[PDB]
Design an enzyme around this catalytic site. Structure first.
Site, short mmCIF file in Angstrom:
data_model
loop_
_atom_site.label_atom_id
_atom_site.label_comp_id
_atom_site.label_asym_id
_atom_site.label_seq_id
_atom_site.Cartn_x
_atom_site.Cartn_y
_atom_site.Cartn_z
N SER A 1 48.65 0.08 -14.31
CA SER A 1 49.50 0.57 -13.23
C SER A 1 48.94 1.87 -12.66
CB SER A 1 50.94 0.79 -13.74
OG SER A 1 51.72 1.14 -12.61
N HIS B 1 38.28 2.84 -24.88
CA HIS B 1 36.88 2.57 -25.19
C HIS B 1 36.38 3.34 -26.44
CE1 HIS B 1 35.66 0.03 -21.59
NE2 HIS B 1 36.95 0.27 -21.41
#
Ligand code: HEM
Ligand SMILES: [Ca+2]
Ligand SMILES: [Ca+2]
Length: 337
Positions: free
Chosen positions: A176, A47
């Site tokens: 994951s 981000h």
């Protein structure tokens, strides 16, 4: 040069990072865990870094400074972008730590992502470079991919920032070790695979299963059905796994699990340096701990079979995997506090 606790480094300015390392392992990550804070920190790396668009720059507009700490320095502005929902928490946790050690926000953001991921079983050891400036401007809005964006949209955005389709799939190995809080808040903490503390290929396997269930009261914008109780599935991950532009590489992390850590490490080194020149930073990589844990064999969840897999790579059949014995147990939300 001589650093604390008898530790050494080639470059004296890397020494401060051993102290930051000690702080964040002990406090932020609760004793070197691969839990909520690590997952939040790895997300924050993207981000911050992805607010970089040469397409805007070429049209005579500011394109964002990339991995520059802007999401932290201008948090009031960035964290209120729609695509940045859920980040205020870890931003507000990390800020005083970086101020306390007097390191740049951009450096800190990548360092916490690299330290944190190293705690995950079988995790990566991401390159860590230091020296990013705290002087930048706020990212433009609309540069962060959202889970309801089309594959064409996501691939165009990532490609503007410098990533090939294969790189986007590699970067998504992060899922994951990942959960959501904001798509369905009633299921805050439900992970994207059965093993959110293991950096393993279960994410690539489980996103290929047929979606069969609605885990909460209803579906929500950006979500699709999950294949297993306790798991959460994003619209984008489902589409990327099946789309001919990305489906063979997705499956390749199942066919060749050993390749996940190196491909992720290479793509993250690039991501961590968007809007930066590496030859103008310094290499503090030896501070990142060595990860522990073998490469695990990917397996089909208990009670699933090969018939439940929507194989999507035309050139190559889905590999033969073991199946876990017995009945499936609902996946636990990621803990904590
Ligand atoms: C390619 C487009 C991507 C999309 C659409 C996407 C989407 C999302 C969404 C919707 C969430 C859940 C946020 C929440 O509701 O709490 C999430 C979580 C997460 N994302 Fe991604 N992501 C993408 C790429 C990446 C990349 C490149 C990284 C890092 C290298 C990353 C790291 C993570 C991590 C670690 C989490 C878990 C956060 C937590 O447990 O709080 N994502 N992602
Ligand atoms: Ca930024
Ligand atoms: Ca996992």
């Amino acid at each position: 040069a001589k650093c604390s606790k008898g530790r050494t480094a080639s470059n004296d300015a890397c020494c401060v990072w051993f102290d930051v390392l000690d702080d964040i392992q002990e406090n932020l990550f609760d004793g070197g865990e691969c839990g909520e804070e690590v997952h939040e920190s790895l997300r924050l790396t993207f981000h911050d870094a992805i607010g970089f668009s040469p397409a805007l720059t070429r049209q005579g507009k500011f394109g964002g400074g990339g991995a520059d700490g802007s999401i932290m320095l201008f948090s009031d502005i960035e964290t209120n972008f729609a695509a940045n929902n859920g980040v205020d928490d870890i931003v507000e946790q990390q800020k005083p730590i970086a101020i306390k050690h007097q390191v740049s926000f951009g450096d800190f953001i990548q360092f916490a992502g690299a330290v944190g991921s190293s705690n995950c079983a079988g995790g990566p050891r991401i390159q860590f470079l230091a020296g990013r400036s705290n002087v930048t401007k706020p990212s433009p809005d609309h540069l962060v991919p959202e889970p309801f964006d089309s594959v064409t949209s996501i691939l165009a955005r990532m490609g503007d920032a410098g990533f090939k389709p294969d790189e986007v799939v590699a970067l998504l190995a992060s899922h994951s070790v990942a959960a959501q809080d904001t798509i369905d808040p009633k299921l805050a903490g439900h992970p994207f695979d059965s093993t959110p503390s293991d950096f393993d290929s279960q994410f690539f396997v489980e996103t290929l299963l047929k979606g069969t269930l609605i885990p909460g009261d209803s579906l929500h914008k950006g979500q699709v059905k999950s294949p297993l109780p306790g798991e959460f599935r994003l619209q984008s991950d489902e589409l990327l796994a099946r789309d001919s532009r990305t489906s063979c590489e997705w499956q390749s992390f199942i066919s060749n699990p050993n390749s996940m850590v190196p491909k992720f490490e290479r793509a993250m080194a690039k991501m961590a340096t968007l809007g930066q020149n590496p030859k103008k930073l310094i290499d503090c990589s030896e501070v990142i701990p060595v990860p522990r844990g073998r490469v695990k064999q990917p397996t089909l969840p208990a009670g699933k079979t090969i018939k439940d897999i929507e194989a999507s790579c035309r050139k190559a059949p889905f590999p033969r995997l073991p199946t876990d014995k017995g009945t499936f147990t609902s996946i636990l939300p990621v803990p904590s506090s």
